[PDB]
Design a binder for this molecule. Sequence first.
Ligand SMILES: OC[C@H]1O[C@@H](O[C@H]2[C@H](O)[C@@H](O)[C@@H](O)O[C@@H]2CO)[C@H](O)[C@@H](O)[C@H]1O
Ligand SMILES: OC[C@H]1O[C@@H](O[C@H]2[C@H](O)[C@@H](O)[C@@H](O)O[C@@H]2CO)[C@H](O)[C@@H](O)[C@H]1O
Ligand SMILES: OC[C@H]1O[C@@H](O[C@H]2[C@H](O)[C@@H](O)[C@@H](O)O[C@@H]2CO)[C@H](O)[C@@H](O)[C@H]1O
Ligand SMILES: OC[C@H]1O[C@@H](O[C@H]2[C@H](O)[C@@H](O)[C@@H](O)O[C@@H]2CO)[C@H](O)[C@@H](O)[C@H]1O
Ligand SMILES: [Ca+2]
Ligand SMILES: [Ca+2]
Ligand SMILES: [Ca+2]
Ligand SMILES: [Ca+2]
Ligand SMILES: [Mn+2]
Ligand SMILES: [Mn+2]
Ligand SMILES: [Mn+2]
Ligand SMILES: [Mn+2]
Lengths: 232, 232, 232, 232
Amino acid sequence: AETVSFNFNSFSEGNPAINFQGDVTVLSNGNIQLTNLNKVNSVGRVLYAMPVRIWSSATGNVASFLTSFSFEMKDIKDYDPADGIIFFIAPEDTQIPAGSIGGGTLGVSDTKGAGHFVGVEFDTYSNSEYNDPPTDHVGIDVNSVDSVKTVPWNSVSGAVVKVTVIYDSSTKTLSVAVTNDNGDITTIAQVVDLKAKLPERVKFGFSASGSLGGRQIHLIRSWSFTSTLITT
Amino acid sequence: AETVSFNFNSFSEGNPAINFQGDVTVLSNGNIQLTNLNKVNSVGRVLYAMPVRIWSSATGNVASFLTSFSFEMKDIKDYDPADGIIFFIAPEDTQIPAGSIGGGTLGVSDTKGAGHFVGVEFDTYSNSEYNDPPTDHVGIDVNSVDSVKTVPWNSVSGAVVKVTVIYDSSTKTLSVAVTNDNGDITTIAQVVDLKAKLPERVKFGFSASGSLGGRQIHLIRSWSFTSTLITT
Amino acid sequence: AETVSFNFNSFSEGNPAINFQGDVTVLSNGNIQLTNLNKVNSVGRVLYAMPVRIWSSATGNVASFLTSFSFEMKDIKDYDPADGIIFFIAPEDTQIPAGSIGGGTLGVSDTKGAGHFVGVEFDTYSNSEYNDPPTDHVGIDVNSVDSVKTVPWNSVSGAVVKVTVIYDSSTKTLSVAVTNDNGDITTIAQVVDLKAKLPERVKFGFSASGSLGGRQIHLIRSWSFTSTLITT
Amino acid sequence: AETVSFNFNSFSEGNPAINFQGDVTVLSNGNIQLTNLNKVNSVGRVLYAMPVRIWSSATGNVASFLTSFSFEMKDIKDYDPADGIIFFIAPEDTQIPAGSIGGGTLGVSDTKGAGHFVGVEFDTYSNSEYNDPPTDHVGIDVNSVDSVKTVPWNSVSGAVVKVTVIYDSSTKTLSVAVTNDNGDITTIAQVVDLKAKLPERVKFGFSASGSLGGRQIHLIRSWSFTSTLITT
Ligand SMILES: OC[C@H]1O[C@@H](O[C@H]2[C@H](O)[C@@H](O)[C@@H](O)O[C@@H]2CO)[C@H](O)[C@@H](O)[C@H]1O
Ligand SMILES: OC[C@H]1O[C@@H](O[C@H]2[C@H](O)[C@@H](O)[C@@H](O)O[C@@H]2CO)[C@H](O)[C@@H](O)[C@H]1O
Ligand SMILES: OC[C@H]1O[C@@H](O[C@H]2[C@H](O)[C@@H](O)[C@@H](O)O[C@@H]2CO)[C@H](O)[C@@H](O)[C@H]1O
Ligand SMILES: OC[C@H]1O[C@@H](O[C@H]2[C@H](O)[C@@H](O)[C@@H](O)O[C@@H]2CO)[C@H](O)[C@@H](O)[C@H]1O
Ligand SMILES: [Ca+2]
Ligand SMILES: [Ca+2]
Ligand SMILES: [Ca+2]
Ligand SMILES: [Ca+2]
Ligand SMILES: [Mn+2]
Ligand SMILES: [Mn+2]
Ligand SMILES: [Mn+2]
Ligand SMILES: [Mn+2]
């Protein structure tokens, strides 16, 4: 089988294994801070530098993957705690949308909320322009921040959240488990055909953004990943 | 929300939080050995002592859960390495089937392979009477060891195996990610309506068995679990 | 290490992790009300359903534990309030004393004020028959409501009180910190050898009671707990 | 009663309510990083600016206090993870010792390991010169880093640790409860007469240090405190 795996317990600029885009910054504690609290419509994204082959045009096989990461969002006096973080998968040449307004676009979509990507968002502000639920929520996005499906969630300021994601190639099911600070878990799952939505080689990463009045701390603390593609 | 969670990095006799059934034994290193290498048709089961309410007849809500565990199977001279381990969910009154022949029933079913339980098996012997695939395999079992679905797998003697399971109540999807000793992952997912197959209160646990000629070391090394039921 | 931990931010009827005894009722807001305002000598107790092994006869080790909880007592028109709440530890088979007169026995002792339990009381009425101090008080009880030690305190009707308790196994010290609504803290500590006063397996819970003329609202709002026993 | 209480969920440079000493720095995420990873024998300390009156010379009374805080330590490539963090109480005019060598002195003592303070240390390196236990440990320090008492502990890189401390004036008992990342708790308690060891007014704070080859990330994430002195 074709397996790719990595595990970061701390990050650092200068590490060739990671690409940085936008206002991203690496704190002295190894944490990744995606947005710049002093910029309007800030957008920051981080990606595993090496593209991963999720499916094969030769065999038609699609990869299965297991990934978990931990992040932290915290309020700052005195802006609206927004907009959130999104774990995404996109073409290997993915870039921050030209003329990105950040905000509710989470740094992956245009003003209409469209883009080429599949992801799991941890959304902390309700943008009616993208049909968001009225509360904080976790959502599965397929080429749009107008989530295909969402589940109520609660973003606790300063709390460390743990996430586990499993993609089963056979059933094409993407299931997500979010462990909150207080111990409660939140789950959401959706059938998503990566073969039909994305190219053979993609990049995995995290993105976050803010607006003029919407800003908050977006930190990525750790990230382990393993994908296995059966080549037969 | 109604949440139940626990974490076992090791086990010790006398812990009220755990229920032992059959030939279970706790080793000095804190590991749990499920079968007795000197008994014919040995069967051993360990269960979380407290019943978990996976669904409420009052609301109709079903709980989501996240659990991870690690186990190890090791060959012994001069017996056949069998039969395997099964992580299962069963009614709270669950007991080792009367007159259990162990072996391919994995300690959860009758001679015909039927029983009242839902589980994930790590099967190391191919029983044609229960329509097993021709190789080692992971399977999703619903009231029978004749798996609803299986995926090829390989049990490596002495290898520590890590497993992660997510059950999403909304989609009723049970997804499993198995991390093999060599780094590759194996996944299998299946939609299973726990509310339709099981009572409101159930017990979670592990079971293993052997026959006269089939015996091996079945070890459970760790187990973390969290289920959250929405009460509203 | 053998660890038991749970966290209740709210309570619900039907949760198998909780045992109800006497006049206990679960309010729609998730709060637990211990006594019945319309009954003479009302007694209500709630216990964590699973017995906890606080010490091992094998090693002689005693567990350390950390627990915090919040409660509220509110006066009603026009009864005396009367009698209070007690956080207790007792044999796993503990039940409301037969023929309990409620009142100053706090639902845990007999008429003489004796019983089998260790606890921290938040006493709002002065029973001279149990040598109570003349004012509201917090006390450490060991097999009797005639406290081994008490400290002055003030029960404010309708005020949410937060409590933190630490039991250090090495020194066998039980320390309590009570945070009043006005920000002021009250502390009390006492050396109590749980190994000598209680059986290996015990249950933790809260009890409240009243009399014909003494009645008030006794509410448990939240409860988190963690006990760790060194096994080696 | 005289009560002092504050709560910090994040810190900021410029907040007059805090004294910054040495290499301390505040990250853009609100965390306080005590030591500088690029300096030899780095020492950084943070103190609550307002001195607290822990005892009255007029009444002989000592104050009781309840404090809880969370911190994080993380290894860096490639130095020994040292030396640790200490929560301390010292004279109001306390400053980092002149010519401090950092390292095992934890920033509060001279080369002999002596100083004027009382504290709880989270020690991650074993200094034989100060009679340290052979493993990571939590210790109670009274005017010396040669702990009056210690308990085995385990510092996990990148894990958030929660600590609760209660000081009971009557019994003069200082009890500590440490909640590790995996849920396990570690406790330690010791009778310490604050009035005989410290002056009437003191400052509370944190300190950390490193050596030439011993360095790690020492972060303070949050801190809540309440002290009550009975004046009568
Ligand atoms: O409050 C946070 C949200 O702000 C929205 O944009 C605001 C903007 O921040 C404010 O300066 C002004 O221009 O009004 C806008 C409309 O609400 C973002 O669109 C949203 O994503 C949040 O960040
Ligand atoms: O070889 C392992 C398998 O044994 C099967 O049972 C055997 C038994 O071990 C042998 O002594 C003889 O009685 O024939 C039996 C039938 O084949 C089990 O049924 C199977 O589960 C494996 O354990
Ligand atoms: O005033 C509250 C206290 O009442 C005591 O019991 C009273 C009882 O309420 C009254 O009706 C009469 O019978 O005299 C009793 C003895 O004083 C309780 O003993 C005490 O615990 C409080 O509840
Ligand atoms: O390895 C961490 C410990 O270092 C000790 O100091 C070392 C120093 O790091 C090294 O460069 C050389 O000078 O030898 C010293 C003595 O062994 C500290 O004393 C100790 O506290 C740890 O930080
Ligand atoms: Ca949004
Ligand atoms: Ca089989
Ligand atoms: Ca009383
Ligand atoms: Ca040291
Ligand atoms: Mn959204
Ligand atoms: Mn099978
Ligand atoms: Mn009393
Ligand atoms: Mn030390």
